[PDB]
């Protein structure tokens, strides 16, 4: 979906019953952030406590 057809909601939704709380989507977002989003392999190194926190900032 190339980073915009996939999420389509995270930008429009930004945490009880949101979309960044589901692993079955968070896993695929991490599988999609691998092929694209050059800021993925970027040396952030800020120790984000939870994957939803890291994932929302990368959208």
């Amino acid at each position: 979906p190339t980073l915009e057809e996939f999420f389509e909601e995270a930008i429009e939704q930004a945490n009880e019953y949101k979309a960044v709380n589901n692993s079955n989507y968070g896993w695929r977002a991490l599988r999609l952030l691998a092929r694209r989003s050059p800021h993925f392999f970027q040396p952030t190194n800020q120790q984000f406590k939870s994957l939803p926190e890291y994932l929302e900032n990368m959208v």
């Binding site: 692993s23 691998a34 392999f41 040396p43 994957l51």
Partner: protein
Amino acid sequence: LCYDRVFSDIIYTVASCTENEASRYGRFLCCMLETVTRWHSYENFRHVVHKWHYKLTKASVHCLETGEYTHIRNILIVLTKILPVLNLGQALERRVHKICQEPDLYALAMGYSGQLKSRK
């Protein structure tokens, strides 16, 4: 810089593997890790490899003590693949806690704990 970036960002790359791509990713990781530990031994290099090991075990405990089924499974098979003091003790304690807290993940955790006890 390449070795730095490979040893730092280990977390999400490990989390995003389909249960055997974690094996194929741990293979290359252990290969370059044994390369580093081979031509490692030299004081500054000792400090930088200490920092690498520290960041690696920190990411490991961070991914183990939380980060449900996919993360723990991938990091378990990876830690098994890269198996060949305080950091080791902390990792072993966290792995034992995760194992006792528990199916197949428990078997993998017990196998990894046994391998660590043998390689103690």
